Amino acid sequence: MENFQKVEKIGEGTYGVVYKARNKLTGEVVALKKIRSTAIREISLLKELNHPNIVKLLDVIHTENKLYLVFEFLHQDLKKFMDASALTGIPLPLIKSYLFQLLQGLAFCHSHRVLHRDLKPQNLLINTEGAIKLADFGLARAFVTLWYRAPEILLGCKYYSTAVDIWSLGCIFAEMVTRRALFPGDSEIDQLFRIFRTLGTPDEVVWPGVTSMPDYKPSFPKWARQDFSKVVPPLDEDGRSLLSQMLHYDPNKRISAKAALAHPFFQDVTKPVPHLRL
Numbered sequence: 421m422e423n424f425q426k427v428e429k430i431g432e433g434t435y436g437v438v439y440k441a442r443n444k445l446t447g448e449v450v451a452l453k454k455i456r457s458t459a460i461r462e463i464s465l466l467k468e469l470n471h472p473n474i475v476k477l478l479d480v481i482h483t484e485n486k487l488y489l490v491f492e493f494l495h496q497d498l499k500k501f502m503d504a505s506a507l508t509g510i511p512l513p514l515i516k517s518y519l520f521q522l523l524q525g526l527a528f529c530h531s532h533r534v535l536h537r538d539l540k541p542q543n544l545l546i547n548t549e550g551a552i553k554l555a556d557f558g559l560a561r562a563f564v565t566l567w568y569r570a571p572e573i574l575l576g577c578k579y580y581s582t583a584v585d586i587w588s589l590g591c592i593f594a595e596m597v598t599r600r601a602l603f604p605g606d607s608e609i610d611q612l613f614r615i616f617r618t619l620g621t622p623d624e625v626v627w628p629g630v631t632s633m634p635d636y637k638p639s640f641p642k643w644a645r646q647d648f649s650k651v652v653p654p655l656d657e658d659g660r661s662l663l664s665q666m667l668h669y670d671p672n673k674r675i676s677a678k679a680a681l682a683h684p685f686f687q688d689v690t691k692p693v694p695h696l697r698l
């Protein structure tokens with residue numbers, strides 16, 4: 421870490437603290453993540469998954485037996501973007517461009533069999549050019565919020581799929597549109613039960629195999645599903661339709677990233693630029 425001057429704390433994950441930092445030699449500004457042999461090998465495969473919609477891992481410094489990840493630096497995240505836009509909301513054309521770009525990112529990682537596992541507005545980073553990028557991709561495998569967790573994770577599936585990322589990104593899409601979190605659980609059972617209340621308690625009709633999942637209980641209350649027009653107004657039909665498919669209970673029915681890219685909602689995509697105050 422001797423090659424860097426820490427200019428400020430950009431945040432604190434479960435893994436460790438992130439710092440905005442300046443390369444003493446190059447003067448490139450980067451985000452420096454302090455973490456805390458298999459983890460080494462996994463992290464080094466991440467150095468090779470490069471895409472415009474993935475925050476670039478620049479370097480990996482294993483020294484004195486600590487681990488530092490040097491990332492491409494961006495000035496804002498979508499969480500901060502949202503709180504800033506809450507009065508008027510993010511315009512639909514920009515919401516739509518953000519979703520499209522993230523889906524692109526996901527389609528890439530997913531085709532290389534890498535999952536994110538922990539998508540949330542704080543790890544979605546934006547720039548002045550209207551780009552949006554996925555941060556912390558692949559780090560969960562390498563080693564607090566439940567709001568974006570897929571139901572098969574909550575029900576105790578150990579072997580879950582890329583579908584878990586589509587679920588989280590659905591939850592985020594709805595949050596951009598409405599300016600409220602979709603399913604703000606403050607425990608595992610609260611999170612599961614908020615999902616049930618909105619989408620209906622899942623059963624064998626909608627999700628074959630559900631009743632045999634590890635933490636499924638026949639004693640779960642039986643709530644009826646709500647209409648989507650009540651969940652995310654004033655989103656149009658194409659958008660509700662797509663959101664519906666990203667929030668399918670059965671991971672095997674849930675839309676893939678690559679198929680979501682083809683949905684009619686994206687017919688008139690554009691790439692607006694946000695007004696960001698840095």
Ligand SMILES: c1ccc2[nH]ncc2c1
Nearest residue numbers: 438451491492493494555
């Ligand atoms: C977390 C991870 C990577 C990052 N790059 N820029 C800001 C930031 C935050």
